[PDB]
DNA sequence: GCGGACTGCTTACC
């Protein structure tokens, strides 16, 4: 097999690489790499090197990386560009791996670990590491084993060994329910003192040195804790064994620390999750995320974690092992490790650089160019500067019965490709008319020869640009995975339907690839399967969809980030002319098709001057279809699904071709390199046939709800609410309020006003019995100190911050009580007037029960009246006025009767 | 007292 790197670092004039050789063994080499950089040279000096602008360069080879760096400074001291890749390990990788890297993930050592530290004096600061590490569990992907390091003897208590027998038993048996599928994978090691544990851990580490190192908060807690504890016990030299090149770097933010372990690639799972999951969670405790991602139960114990080792060491160790397994389970579902390796090897970068789309693209573009013997420009300093973005129509707040939406495929990247926007394809400029002159096809055709954006920029149509070229490569990967996702999703609905009439029999899940639409043979079998087998198939489908979602949405993110990066001053190819070329063209494309679409519908409906498009944001249009439906008459339809089929067809056969024509003309108008504005139907929405449901409503920009029957070719088994912007979607809204508000909306859109009012009456009556956590608001807790004045709210102190201060006063002098962490999230509750806390709200760390010290008092004093009116009624009022309906029966003349 | 204009902060939508 082809070789592939695992890790690369630069240490002085040396490149240290770990790699898998052609016989699949892991090696390590130190290479005294001799890099090249480039200077512009006279045109008379023949060469094979040119900058992206076609100017010739001479290659300078250096004796070592140090001389290359010093020459860069000198060149600045002179005032001349020093071209080429200045990140030498990216050059090294490019030289060394001059081909499409095919990697074998089974050859890559992925380690997942988690440590426990009993601390009586609150949270154990990693920079200090005052307290013994009393457990480590460390899963090795090569061995497929959980290595458990259990401290039996500590100044905080001596305990008996953990029992694997008991670990495996059900909780109802007094066991820990350590998943049976890992019991035989546990390698348990007890120790009679910390020193021996740590030294054994290190010796283990040498033998099985991680390439990818992950876990949950491992970068901000586990790694710096382990590093410093070993450092403070055995000394710096021993601590450095954690690095396969015995080099570490302490990066400090005082007094926190991030340790950099040379030769290892740390991908903290919490950071992968935040960047790639596309969620915003009220809490990021592994407990909370596990329950959310896997539907497993919150782990239970009877005391504070601070005493868990002492009172139930058996459970303490089982829970440490489980914590490690939960991340593996989340990754098996979400697959962010795979994504990282994929992306990393594609760009040819340090795997941890997947967190930086700028580095990722610098690398991809560098390799693409190096390929053609081209030379990349030197990075330059630029001041930060604002610039305009998308257009968003101002909707008329109202209900809207029948709606179909359309959306442009990969919008900004398609503009990049269509127009041919790249640093080196710029041709010149033209004098711009006002934007609406272009939108209205009234302005003078910008250019006859070059491809144009209405911001004034022209680009060459002939030449290929490296930006369009490389963004197209990733776009095509995105498109492949999205197909798998959507097919898996369609399969899913097939399975959900057949689950309505399951055969009462015994059988097994069919062996099928859910990435592709089921064959008619598969469907026939399906409709003969047991419920058991069907539910298992449905699980596998949904898992295939998630896997597809991760792969597609994150390649989407990467290419949109290339768009973004053109407007970041740290990007080698920063250029506000290209950034604006894109967003301005987009503003045009949208408002142009609003016109064409409006024109086309008035026509085929024989109408004149009616506004079909009621909304659009960036690149989408939401079309009111009341009149399309009305031209046929509702009575012409057997059932809901009937007219849904109707609009699917109508949109497919009539509308899209018109839009196709509409954009082809725009392409012509701008003389663009290639027509790539592909706008397909998105959602079909409307009330159930015969129902009094209102179908949909908008409250304003970015705030709407629709009752959807078909989404991008997925015909749902039951209608799905698509709600955007409203409080049901926001992590800051209490859980029970979200659920309640969503049910009000479901009722409005599906059933009608009378339903809504019934539900509201009931909610109002019973809502005081809801668990406090479910009615707590959530907020991020930033700049607590900024607003802390002697324990009390400084000027302009935000509501949630006030609540934190209320908390800190209430727990003052309880070293043990949970502290609110700067930057992390808090639950917030309002308190009734005259409460013992001396303020109107109180806040505590999200994801947690409020400390027993004050919990009872908080519950007594919660302000249910404010909670309800402020978090539930106000939003509800907003929705219903928008839609023209009442959530309470107004007082009327009829009141005078019985 | 407190509405309305502004501001900081938060978290959506693309
Ligand atoms: C979601 C998102 C969009 N955008 C911009 C660029 C997107 O092309 C444009 C439209 O947003 P989207 O329509 O949501 O995404 P998309 O058009 O790029 O790809 P697709 O619709 O096929 O799933 O908004 C960003 O810049 N950053 C983002 O995170
Ligand atoms: Ca001993
Ligand atoms: Ca789009
Ligand atoms: Ca059946
Ligand atoms: Na159980
Ligand atoms: Na869109
Ligand atoms: Na689409
Ligand atoms: Na199409």
> What's the A806 CA to ligand 3 centre distance in angstroms?
45
Question: Could you give the C-alpha distances from A223 to A112, A114, A136, A257, A469, in angstroms and in order?
Answer: 12, 9, 11, 10, 40
SS3 A632: helix
SS3 A884: coil
Nucleotide nearest to A784 (CA to C1'): B9
Rounded to the nearest 5 percent, the helix, strand and coil shares of chain A are: 45, 20, 35
Cα dihedral A791, A793, A797, A799 sign = positive
Output the distance from A724 CA to B12 C1' rounded to whole Å. Answer: 8
What are the tokens at A81?
Answer: 């560009």
Nearest CA to ligand 1 atom 26: A560
Nearest CA to ligand 1 atom 1: A557
What are the tokens at A863?
Answer: 């302000």
Output the distance from A88 CA to B12 C1' rounded to whole Å. Answer: 41
Range A220-249 burial, b when 16+ CB lie within 10 A, else e: ebbbbbbbbbbbebeeeeebbbbbbbeebe
Question: Could you give the C-alpha distances from A44 to A55, A113, A460, in angstroms and in order?
Answer: 11, 60, 27
Distance of alpha carbon A208 from alpha carbon A534, whole angstroms: 41
SS3 A394: coil
Distance of alpha carbon A253 from alpha carbon A144, whole angstroms: 36
Contacts (Cβ under 8 Å, ≥6 apart) of A183? A164, A167, A168
User: Which domains, and CATH codes, for chain A?
Assistant: 1-108+336-378 (3.30.342.10), 109-335 (3.30.420.10), 379-464+569-725 (3.90.1600.10), 465-568 (1.10.287.690), 726-770+863-884 (1.20.1280.300), 771-862 (3.40.1820.10)
> What's the A414 CA to ligand 3 centre distance in angstroms?
10
B chain positions with any atom within 7 Å of a protein CB: 8-14
Helices and strands per DSSP (H, E), number in chain A? 28, 33
Residues with C-beta less than 6 Å from any ligand 1 atom: A 407-412, 556, 560, 563-564, 618-619
Counting ligand 1 atoms within 8 A of each CB, the residue from A410, A413, A477 with the most, and so the one to mutate, is: A410
Q: Which residues surround ligand 5, an ion (CB under 5 A)?
A: A 171
> What's the A557 CA to ligand 6 centre distance in angstroms?
13
Tokens 């003192």, residue located: A193
3-state secondary structure A708-771: EEEECCEEEEEEEEEEECCHHHCCCCCHHHHHHHHHHHHHHHHCCHHHHHHHHHHHHHHHHHCC
SS3 A275: helix
Distance of alpha carbon A16 from alpha carbon A10, whole angstroms: 6
Nucleotide nearest to A411 (CA to C1'): B14
H helices of A295-402, where? Answer: 305-334, 336-347, 357-371
> What's the A193 CA to ligand 2 centre distance in angstroms?
6
């Amino acid at each position: 097999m082809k070789e592939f790197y695992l890790t690369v670092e630069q240490i002085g004039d040396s490149i240290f690489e770990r790699y898998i050789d052609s016989n699949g063994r892991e090696r390590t080499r130190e290479v005294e790499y001799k890099p090249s950089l480039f200077a512009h040279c006279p045109e008379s000096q023949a060469t094979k090197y040119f900058d992206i602008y076609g100017k010739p360069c001479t290659r300078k080879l250096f004796a070592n990386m140090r001389d290359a760096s010093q020459w860069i400074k000198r060149m600045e001291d002179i005032g001349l560009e020093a071209l080429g890749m200045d990140d030498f390990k990216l050059a090294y990788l490019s030289d060394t791996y001059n081909y499409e890297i095919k990697y074998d993930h089974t050859k890559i050592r992925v380690a997942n670990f988690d440590i426990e530290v009993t601390s009586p004096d609150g949270f154990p600061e990693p920079s200090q590491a005052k307290h013994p590490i009393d457990a480590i569990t460390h899963y090795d992907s090569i061995d497929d084993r959980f290595y458990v390091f259990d401290l039996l003897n500590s100044p905080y208590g001596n305990v008996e060994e953990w029992s694997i027998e008991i670990a495996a038993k059900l909780q109802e048996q007094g066991g820990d329910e350590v998943p049976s599928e890992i019991i035989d994978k546990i390698i348990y090691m007890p120790f009679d003192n910390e020193k021996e544990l740590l030294m054994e851990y290190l010796n283990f580490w040498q033998q099985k040195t991680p390439v990818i190192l992950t876990g949950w908060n491992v970068e901000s807690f586990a790694i710096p804790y382990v590093y410093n504890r070993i450092k403070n016990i055995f000394g710096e030299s021993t601590a450095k064994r954690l690095s396969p090149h015995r080099k570490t770097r302490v990066k400090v933010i005082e007094s926190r620390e991030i340790i950099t372990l040379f030769g290892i690639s740390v991908l903290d799972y919490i950071d992968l999750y935040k960047k790639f999951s596309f969620t915003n969670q009220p809490s990021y405790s592994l407990d909370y995320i596990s329950e959310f991602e896997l539907n497993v139960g919150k782990l239970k114990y009877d005391g504070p974690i601070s005493k868990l080792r002492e009172s139930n060491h058996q459970r303490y160790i089982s829970y440490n092992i489980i914590a490690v397994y939960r991340v593996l389970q989340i990754d098996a579902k979400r697959q962010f490790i795979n994504l990282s390796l994929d992306m990393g090897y594609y760009a040819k970068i340090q795997i941890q650089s997947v967190f930086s789309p700028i580095k990722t693209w610098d690398a991809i573009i560098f390799n693409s160019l190096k390929e053609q013997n081209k030379v990349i420009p030197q990075g330059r300093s630029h001041p930060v500067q604002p610039y305009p973005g998308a257009f968003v129509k101002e909707p008329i707040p109202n209900r809207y019965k029948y709606v179909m939406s359309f959306d442009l495929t990969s919008f900004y990247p398609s503009i990049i490709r269509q127009v041919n926007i790249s640093p080196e394809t710029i041709a010149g400029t033209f004098k711009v008319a006002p934007l609406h002159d272009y939108i209205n096809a009234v302005a003078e055709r910008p250019s006859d020869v070059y491809s144009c954006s209405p911001n004034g920029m022209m680009y060459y149509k002939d030449r290929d640009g490296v930006v369009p070229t490389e963004i197209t490569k990733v776009f095509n990967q995105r498109k492949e995975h999205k197909g798998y996702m959507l097919a898996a999703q369609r399969n899913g609905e097939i399975i959900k339907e057949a689950l309505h009439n399951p055969n009462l029999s015994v059988d097994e899940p069919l062996d099928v690839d859910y990435r592709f639409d089921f064959s008619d043979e598969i469907k026939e079998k399906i409709k003969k399967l047991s419920a058991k087998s069907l539910n298992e198939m449905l699980f596998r489908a949904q898992r295939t969809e998630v896997a597809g979602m991760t792969a597609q949405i994150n390649r989407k993110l990467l290419i949109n980030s290339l768009y973004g990066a053109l407007g970041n001053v740290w990007f080698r190819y920063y250029d506000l002319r290209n950034a604006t070329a894109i967003t301005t063209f987009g503003q045009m494309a949208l408002q142009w098709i609003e016109r064409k679409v409006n024109e086309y519908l008035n026509e085929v409906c024989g109408t004149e001057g009616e506004a079909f498009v009621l909304y659009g944001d960036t690149d989408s249009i939401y079309v009111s279809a009341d009149k399309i439906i009305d031209k046929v008459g509702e009575s012409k339809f057997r059932d809901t699904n009937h007219w849904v089929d109707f609009l699917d067809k109508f949109a497919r056969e009539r509308m899209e071709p018109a839009i196709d024509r509409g954009f082809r003309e725009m392409c012509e108008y701008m003389n663009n390199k290639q027509h790539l504005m592909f706008m397909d139907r998105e959602a079909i929405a409307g009330p159930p046939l015969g129902s009094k449901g209102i179908g949909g409503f908008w409250t304003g920009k970015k705030r709407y709800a629709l009752n959807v029957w078909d989404m991008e070719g997925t015909r749902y088994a039951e209608p799905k609410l698509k709600i955007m912007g409203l409080e049901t979607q926001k992590s800051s809204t209490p859980k029970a309020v979200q659920k309640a508000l969503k049910e009000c909306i479901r009722r409005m859109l599906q059933e009608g006003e009378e339903s809504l009012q019934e539900y509201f009456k009931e909610f109002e009556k019973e809502f005081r019995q809801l668990n406090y956590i479910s009615i707590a608001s959530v907020s991020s807790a930033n700049n607590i100190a900024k607003y802390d004045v002697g324990g009390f709210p400084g000027p302009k102190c935000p509501f949630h911050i006030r609540g934190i201060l209320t908390y800190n006063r209430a727990i003052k002098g309880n070293i043990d009580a949970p502290q609110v962490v700067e930057g992390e999230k808090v639950y917030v509750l309002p308190l009734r007037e005259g409460n013992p806390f001396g303020d109107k709200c109180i806040a505590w760390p999200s994801g947690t029960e409020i400390t027993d010290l004050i919990k009872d008092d908080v519950l007594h004093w919660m302000d249910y009246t404010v909670l309800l009116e402020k978090t539930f009624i106000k939003p509800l009022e907003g929705f219903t006025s928008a839609a023209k309906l009442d959530y309470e029966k107004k007082a009327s003349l009829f009141d005078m009767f019985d």
